[PDB]
Paper text:
Collagen VI links the cell surface to the extracellular matrix to provide mechanical strength to most mammalian tissues, and is linked to human diseases including muscular dystrophy, fibrosis, cardiovascular disease and osteoarthritis. Collagen VI assembles from heterotrimers of three different α-chains into microfibrils, but there are many gaps in our knowledge of the molecular assembly process. All collagen VI chains have a short collagenous region flanked by globular N and C-termini, which are mainly composed of domains homologous to the A-domains of Von Willebrand factor (vWA)2. Collagen VI assembles in a hierarchical manner where three collagen VI α-chains associate to form heterotrimers.
Therefore, to understand how collagen VI monomers assemble, an expression system was designed to generate mini-collagen VI heterotrimers with the C-terminal domains of the α1, α2 and α3 chains and a short stretch of collagenous sequence with nine Gly-X-Y triplets. Processing of the cryoEM data revealed that there was substantial flexibility between the vWA domains, presumably due to the interdomain linkers, but a core of three vWA domains could be resolved, with additional diffuse areas of density, likely to be the other three vWA domains, seen in the 2D classes. Local refinements of the most structurally homogenous region yielded a 3.14 Å resolution structure, with additional diffuse areas of density for the other three vWA domains seen at higher thresholds. The three vWA domains, which were resolved to high resolution, were the α3 C1 and C2 domains and the α2 C2 domain, where the α3 C2 domain is adjacent to the α3 C1 domain. The trimeric coiled coil has hydrophobic amino acids involved in stabilising the internal surface. The coiled coil is stabilised by two interchain disulphide bonds between α3 and α2, and α2 and α1 chains. The α3 C1 domain packs closely against the coiled coil, with Tyr597 from the α2 chain coiled coil contributing to a hydrophobic pocket with residues Ile2380, Phe2399 and Phe2506, which likely stabilises the interface. The opposite side of the α3 C1 domain interacts with the α2 C2 domain, where salt bridges are formed between residues Asp2462 and Arg965 and Arg 2501 and Glu941. The mini-collagen VI structure shows how this occurs for collagen VI, as there is a short region of the collagenous triple-helical domain visible in the structure emerging from the coiled coil region. The interchain hydrogen bonds and stagger suggest that the α3 chain is trailing, the α2 chain is the middle and the α1 chain is leading, going from a C- to N-terminal direction using the convention defined in ref.
Numbering used by the authors:
A (entry chain B): 586 to 606, 814 to 1019
B (entry chain C): 2367 to 2820
C (entry chain A): 584 to 608
Write the structure that this text describes.
């Protein structure tokens, strides 16, 4: 295998000299980085909307448990290494259900994800965002430690109450959040996603099908993304 | 089949490009060789309204010179302005710089409140290396530059060296525009490789013309490859980072410890031996390792064979070649490529490490001052053999052995074996989700710079 | 195994370079 190939010269020229048109040859974007044990607190936000459904909730539960298992979770609240996981489900009432706060208690998160019950009711993305910010980060216990970056995961189909969208985005931006929204469906409003992504469209993962969470390639890419 | 080819010189290709390119010989943009520029504004104690005004004006001048990227194409400098104190916070993100005008407006309007907490500049380096520069654009000749501003002189602590090593590992070239000269810091930066940082002095009031010339031409604008000889670098910052040249009499002594057929499928073993061979190729073996006093030696060791549990008469490891067993690089590379073979035994990690350090390093004549023990683990390590191994590591750390751990695959646990690598575990411990990752730039560069971090 | 080639050399590198920057001045 050559040390550099047609794509390597491709990007060499596109980098040192310039561009035109923009045309995208080959595929090399956002090299990210194989994750060390750096401290990361991952908050999952799930759609309580009627559209999500029941077996979809089961598939999302399987995905969340799988990622919580795969990642190297922490061992204490103030851990400087590893990572933590929390799940939130925004539904009808303002006091959204806390499936579990930021926890490394793998048995606890497994049993909670087994015992978490679908809501199946109208919800608002901004309401869920503010509730997560005020119930995990601002929570008295299990709050995101400052040295650990915060990553908001949005298991939202996109079609959900927009009330307090720009305000919710600003509140997330204040808390140094790095959202990574997942669009599980075909009827997803790209613009509410862009608002949710805080500007970048590389932080939104579009899925061909509802069960796309289980594909090994998507799982690996997303795992590298958050970790 | 084949392992892989040899990349041509980066500067030669860049020069061959910028002379047969009707897109380069036009205006002289400053941020050539696109860069991710991180500005770690000092919002610590001793910074008042005037000091922050001056610092923000310096940042504004620099960003005024630059040309911010405004498309998916990999060009121009993308600016991320964070503010660091006892904690670190992000004000402008890499993806937030959609346009130069809005970025400049944000910087000018940036009025982050002054804090009353100490200067954790080391925390700033760690956060910038790990979090801020985590997701960056794909590019081989992309540059990672951080301009840290400092006003309160630093202190000589091990964490400073840890953070400097983290910066070097992440591929980020620092630049400390200190207000006053602190010897401790500039000494800490003095781990010199092809990605070594530097510290400047920020003058008072005006006279920032020549100062900006120095801080832009030598560090941000070009900083490389026709580096403006009147910079003082001495061609000490090209791309494709390596360690110092052969002129550096590096007294390294690296011993690799591999795993048996237990979770080392021929694929993984081929990858590990390829990585070891590449690592050797990028070093300086002594012409006569047996009698020479200087230069380097290497050894590769496999885990225990099957017939080593009932007794210990035979070596607990299959010593493939001791330090002073090969005097030529070509012979060793050929042996690794062809002569290597698995052994189909058990792990017994602690005993293997102890025997390797007691009968491969010490037995060799004229031991080097700094010695490194690499562990390439690709399988579960039973807890019964965990503690003993770590105990051995402690002893090896008392005699001056720097340790590199490469957990391969998902089977190998990472919670316990993380601490085996020498401090800091972020750089010395490495994770690969696949064996192939051993032969990719993010790990080849780390291996190349390994003599520097020790 | 053999050390792979140095990549696009001469013909290939020149072809790519004159293919990308065929639209600028
Ligand atoms: C949390 O997990 C414990 C056991 O798991 C271990 O401890 C965790 C802190 C974490 O480090 C895991 O990775 C470890 O494997 C669960 O065990 C409970 O222990 C308490 C007493 O300590 C006992 O009264 C319960 O009956 C145990 N329950 C179970 C299911 O084993 C604990 O339950 C987990 N937390 C919750 C809220 O369930
Ligand atoms: C570059 O560094 C070397 C070695 O310095 C030590 O190792 C480095 C990796 C880093 O950890 C430093 O902080 C260490 O101090 C320097 O080589 C030494 O140079 C001095 C005189 O300049 C000489 O007396 C020593 O014998 C050298 N030691 C060697 C070669 O092993 C080298 O000078 C540095 N380059 C500079 C400062 O430009
Ligand atoms: C905003 O969010 C509300 C919440 O339900 C929704 O009804 C509305 O369609 C969204 N869009 C606008 C423009 O208000
Ligand atoms: C096992 O080891 C003992 C001593 O450790 C030795 O005497 C004996 O021959 C060995 N058995 C073998 C090699 O089969």
């Amino acid at each position: 295998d050559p040390g550099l190939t047609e794509c390597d010269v491709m990007t060499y020229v596109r980098e040192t000299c310039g561009c035109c048109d923009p045309d995208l040859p080959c595929q090399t974007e956002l090299s990210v980085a194989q994750c060390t044990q750096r401290p990361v607190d991952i908050v999952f936000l799930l759609d309580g909307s009627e559209r999500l459904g029941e077996q979809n909730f089961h598939k999302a539960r399987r995905f969340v448990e799988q990622v919580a298992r795969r990642l190297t979770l922490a061992r204490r609240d103030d851990d400087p290494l590893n990572a933590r996981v929390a799940l939130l489900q925004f539904g009808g009432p303002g006091e959204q259900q806390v499936a579990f706060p930021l926890s490394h208690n793998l048995t606890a998160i497994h049993e909670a994800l087994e015992t978490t019950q679908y809501l199946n009711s109208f919800s608002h993305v901004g309401a869920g965002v503010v509730h997560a910010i005020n119930a995990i980060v601002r929570s008295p216990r299990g709050g995101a430690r400052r040295h650990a970056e915060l990553s908001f995961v949005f298991l939202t189909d996109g079609v959900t109450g927009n009330d307090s969208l720009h305000e919710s985005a600003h509140s997330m931006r204040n808390e140094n959040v790095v959202p990574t929204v997942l669009a599980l469906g075909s009827d997803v409003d790209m613009d509410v996603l862009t608002t949710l992504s805080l500007g970048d469209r590389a932080a939104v993962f579009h899925e061909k099908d509802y069960d796309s969470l289980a594909q090994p390639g998507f799982f690996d890419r997303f795992i590298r993304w958050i970790c | 089949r084949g392992n892989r080819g040899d990349s041509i010189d980066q500067c030669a290709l860049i020069q061959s490009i910028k002379d047969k390119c009707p897109c380069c010989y036009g205006p002289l943009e400053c941020p050539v060789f696109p860069t991710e520029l991180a500005f770690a504004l000092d919002t610590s104690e001793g910074v008042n309204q005037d000091t922050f005004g001056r610092m923000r004006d310096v940042v504004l001048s620099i960003v005024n010179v630059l040309t911010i990227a405004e498309s998916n194409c990999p060009t121009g400098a993308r600016v991320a302005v964070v503010t660091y104190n006892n904690e670190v916070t992000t004000e402008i993100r890499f993806a937030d710089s959609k346009r130069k005008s809005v970025l400049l407006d944000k910087i000018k309007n940036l009025q982050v409140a002054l804090t009353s907490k100490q200067q954790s500049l080391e925390t700033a380096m760690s956060f910038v290396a790990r979090n801020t520069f985590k997701r960056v654009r794909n590019g081989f000749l992309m540059r990672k530059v951080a301009v840290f501003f400092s006003n309160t002189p630093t202190r000589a602590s091990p964490q400073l060296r840890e953070a400097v090593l983290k910066l070097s590992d992440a591929g980020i070239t620092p630049l400390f525009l200190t207000r006053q000269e602190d010897r401790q810091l500039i000494n800490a930066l003095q781990i010199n490789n092809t990605a070594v940082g530097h510290a400047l002095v920020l003058p008072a009031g005006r006279d920032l013309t020549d100062f900006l010339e120095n801080v832009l031409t030598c560090h941000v604008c070009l900083d490389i490859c026709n580096i403006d000889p009147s910079c003082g670098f001495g061609s000490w910052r090209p791309s494709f980072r390596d360690a110092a040249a052969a002129g550096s009499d590096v007294d390294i002594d690296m011993a690799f410890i591999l795993d048996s057929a237990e979770t080392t499928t021929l694929f993984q073993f081929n990858e590990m031996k390829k990585y070891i061979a590449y690592l050797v190729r990028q070093l300086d073996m002594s012409p006569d390792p047996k009698a020479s006093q200087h230069f380097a030696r290497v050894a590769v060791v496999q885990h225990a064979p099957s017939e080593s549990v009932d007794n210990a008469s035979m070596p607990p490891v299959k010593v493939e070649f001791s330090l002073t067993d090969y005097g030529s690089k070509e012979k060793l590379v050929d042996f690794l490529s062809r002569g290597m073979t698995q052994l189909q035994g058990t792990r017994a990690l602690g005993s293997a490490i102890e025997y390797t350090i007691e009968n491969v390093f010490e037995s060799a004549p004229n031991p080097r001052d700094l010695k490194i023990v690499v562990l390439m683990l690709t399988g579960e390590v039973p807890e019964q053999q965990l503690e003993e191994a770590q105990r051995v590591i402690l002893q090896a750390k008392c005699k001056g052995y720097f340790f590199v751990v490469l957990g391969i695959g998902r089977k190998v646990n990472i919670k316990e074996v993380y601490t085996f690598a020498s401090e800091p575990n972020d750089v010395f411990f490495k994770l690969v989700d696949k064996s192939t990752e051993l032969n990719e730039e993010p790990l080849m560069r780390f291996g190349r710079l390994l003599p520097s971090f020790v | 195994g053999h050390q792979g080639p140095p990549g696009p050399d001469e013909c290939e590198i020149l072809d790519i370079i004159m293919k990308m920057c065929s639209c600028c001045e």
